[PDB]
Symmetry: D3
Subunit: 256 residues, 6 copies
């Protein structure tokens, strides 16, 4: 049972800022353990390449790959490619990665390979959903607990269970609607709710989840490493639709 030195990110005590030297000297297990209760780890000034990034992330579990799989599709390059959604340049609204049985994701790793001309756009943001669900007005929590949420990729509709109870956390899976004007790769709905009701629900929940007690915004710089426990937080990418911006991240996903 080893200890890493860290500082909290949130005023509530959530999140972990870790010095690069303390991170690199830490055992994989010490950070994986810390992620469970801190939700996310932020390390700056780590100058590595994609292979080293791969050696760091692959130690945390079985690589979840981004006509089936042979372990080759490991590192996803999110480089802001025109005409794409996930690897594109617009918003990716509140979601958690992966899916449910073998497609489950426990840890997500995002490394900044190259960031230029961007200072206040394109953040990866992170939400402490368990503290948020514990504190939200019961009228918001009741919908998340009792209603059937369905998603369509843009009878195309399928159910996404909002809460999967792992004991230590209720793992959250949800897919917020992309804001108007943003290229959408998915679309949510709530069974028995109208479009008006669903739209208003998501807007009010989104506003609640983005209050600074639960919300962390990460503005990217070269060398940043953002690791998330995918069952403990949900996340979002803010838009970066300016052609002068260079924003290249490497993405890794693991599970046990």
């Amino acid at each position: 049972s080893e200890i890493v030195k860290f500082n909290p990110v949130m005023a509530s005590g959530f999140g972990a800022y870790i010095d690069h030297r303390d991170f690199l000297e830490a055992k994989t297990e010490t950070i994986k353990n810390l992620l469970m209760r801190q939700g996310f780890v932020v390390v700056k000034n780590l100058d590595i390449d994609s292979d080293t990034f791969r050696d760091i992330y692959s130690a945390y579990g079985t690589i979840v790959e981004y006509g089936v799989g042979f372990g080759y599709r490991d590192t996803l390059k999110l480089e802001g490619e025109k005409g794409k959604i996930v690897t594109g340049r617009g918003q990716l609204p509140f979601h958690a990665d992966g899916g449910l049985l073998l497609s489950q994701v426990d840890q997500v790793f995002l490394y900044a390979a190259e960031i230029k001309n961007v200072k206040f756009r394109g953040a990866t943001t992170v939400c402490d959903h368990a503290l948020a669900c514990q504190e939200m007005p019961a009228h918001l929590l009741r919908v998340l607990e009792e209603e059937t949420f369905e998603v369509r990729v843009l009878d195309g509709w399928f159910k996404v269970p909002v809460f999967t109870d792992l004991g230590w956390v209720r793992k959250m899976l949800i897919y917020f609607p992309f804001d108007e004007g943003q290229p959408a790769s998915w679309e949510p709905r709530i069974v028995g709710f109208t479009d008006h009701e669903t739209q208003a629900f998501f807007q009010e929940l989104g506003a609640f989840l983005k209050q600074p007690r639960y919300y962390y915004k990460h503005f990217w710089e070269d060398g940043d490493l953002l690791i998330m426990d995918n069952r403990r937080v949900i996340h979002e990418r803010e838009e970066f639709n300016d052609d002068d911006i260079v924003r290249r991240l490497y993405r890794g996903q693991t599970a046990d």
Copy 2:
């Protein structure tokens, strides 16, 4: 001096959720007493008809009639029994009649899950915590109302245990209006800015409970301890039928 089991609704400890059996076994006076300090009572899964509803509420005092039990069924063409917003108000200060307790029972609710809420505001805690420039206006300025379906409405009436609030907010743009407020010496710009800013203060989750209705819900409010609002439900598919009762003592 009996005790009813309850759980608080708000995080501040205000509000009371009471189980339907506990509610029915409790004496009228036990619930009536709890209402004064908790402001509102929420009972779910209570299966009663309109006659039983009358028998429950009429025990709380003298029935304040309208011109017995009001049927708010969402009629196309009306205001109070219409399908739109009824903004922040307290009951009985327009057609000047003392109202102490307000009762709302859901007879039938269909096709509505995130519209048509009855909302409730803890005004005493909000007045205690609000910025001085907001409270200043409420305490010092003359507030007047005109019916639209000009007279002075005293904002605070000190009953000791609470400063009973009587106020009538402006209806949101596009909602059919039953009243219209004004503040003496304030321009229209100023009054509108005032009410928008105060309304946003009052709707913060520390003071504000939103009730989304289901068949068998009973909402009881102490009319001197809270103010309330109906949110719009202007979609023809919605069935929202509520029974309303109003009581007072002399």
Copy 3:
């Protein structure tokens, strides 16, 4: 419905410090109303004699006599008018007489700066926040008292706006005792442990105000909203002379 200017005493917003001029210009009913939600009023630098004191307090209701104005002058040999502790209690539940407002005026205070406080406790906020095992006892167990200078004293009497508390703490070891409490089904060990732990809860600064007396101080308490205590002042050099008035309505 007039307003008196005031500043809160506690950090929670409870209590009311009122300037002596503001107090004298205010109507009786304005102070009487504020007392219900603030629990207590503190006025400093008020220069009145005993006749004027009577005229101020008698306006609040019907005088509850003792056997008019009580003179608590620290007499060697007595208890209530003695020089020792009077532990946490509310007024009028031993010699069963309703007391709504209690008034204490300092006629003369000399050689005392950190003894002989009258202390005041916000019981409603404390009951709302106390550990369940403490509140459990207060709500469910039978509390009894015996005069010593056995009968049931109902801990809570629900008046709606407050649960009026009637309780009589044990006197600290070495203080002359006017009463003695017991809890039915509790051993002496258990009761003593209970009261020590509850007393420490009630004395935390969030709920507890300690008043150190000065010439011209006036302390008014709403007897249903607070409980109070006198701390010992057993040093012969101390002059602590207070006038006491007690009022109630039916």
Copy 4:
């Protein structure tokens, strides 16, 4: 993934009061899950015998043993005795893992303010404690002797740092164990424990359960630490059934 209805015990939101009907209708896994984040579960008005108690608890994992412990207040004994059991978690003096502890009240008479089982939210307390208290817990070696071996204070399970600690018995209470901290004098160790204990007993972190017939207390042993307060009055009947499980 079912939901049991519950109300929190602490103002922080920790603990779960669960109605007896709701408890009995819930899947084992639902409660077992809830315990991880809530720390402890309190059910009142349950009327079961020892066999049913066994059926309830054994479903949570492997029984740690000789299965049900009858803590009845037997004289001349320690754990099964009538005095204090100070702050601890179960299963670190024997070297056997305990995940869940279950306590049931089969008979309580003549006790209203004594013999409590108390529970402490150790993860919130560690996150909020003064740093000079935390430093000792994290960096010093704590040893225990059964009435000398190293017991690690924290074992990092990810979701919680499981606490294994054995507090000293108050004077006058018969000790079943005795702690020490390597490098500290007897003065220093006593002071450290007195100060830490008072921090742990603050109402934000501390629940006291006074027992009544039919109460069931379930604790997740990695998430909380616990204590038994003395009940050395001979008129008291305090008879509890005890069950322990782990994976």
Copy 5:
């Protein structure tokens, strides 16, 4: 070292409401001292002329100038105009130090909810703001053009980090200045300021003073930042005396 009696303005304990008699009886140094930790002083019901106002303020230090500014709501002007003055501290566009600002109300008619002078507790706000907002304030270069030069956001005085910042004017309000942040696009700078402004306007950090005849507002210019809300209704008389001092 005298004491003036006061009541705090904010729930945090910042600000000082001081009765007019108590204000007039207090030594200058007592108020000047109080302002450092309280940020701002509010006195109501003071009936003075411009000469007495000058006597009061000039005693606090050297007058920064042409001594008293008559902000009367003159049309076709900016500072002395009728529209918004966004968040700023005084004296960084001219290069002259301002320690204390004094504002007195000589005539107010027909305005009850407009033309406020507002005050912001910047040190509490910086200590509590999201880190992505603070990082910009601490590490980026902010420039201003008077309607381009570097204005340092923080100047460390020890007891406070004095803030010099010039917010952008809302659209439709005549701009007396214009800000920029080096390395940020126009989109980014607008977003940063919109988000920061809303954080600064939260009631924990923000006092709004609606003016009445006889009000005196004194601000310590190193401890707070301030704003004037628009009053572009022609029926309004808003006439303030303004004084500024420094050491």
Copy 6:
């Protein structure tokens, strides 16, 4: 206007933990500025000697010397010498250093030269008096504000003004009574209060000031440097009366 990296010590945001490398690279002025609002600075693993300690502290102002002065009595060695009070082994109760006109002290520096056999005794403790005075029951604050406090060194009695208003802080000077059994070098009294009242006042104020929101306890190790802004905090030494303990600190005092 430079910035040092630091972490708060208190949950309220008070105090500054500074990495040794960040401290040593910082300009004197940056730490002196920070002390004003953080009250105290804590640096660990600084391995210096008494001359270097002197070069560090003397840059902060004019050396306050511990038959008058010529600048030679600069560094005080508190080594737990038997039969002494200040440089002895018992408690030094709540006080601030120095006095009032030329004997005023602005910054105090305490460096640990040698610490052995002590893990939970002999702490230097630090109190955030301004937050404490702002939050205390008015009955405690009223005594500090309105009564005359006098001190005697053990018509030997002299007045100590509790509050000296510097604007940014009310500088506190107070001398708590030494606990029973501890060798006392001073004795307080309050004019018009009896011994009983004074004793009870100090006990209740002391309990209030020692609540963790205001109180920091420093357990010494080799290489620790504790710097205090003497106007912003008050402090205390807890007893270390065990003969096996080695506790040698170096002390420096400066003022402007």
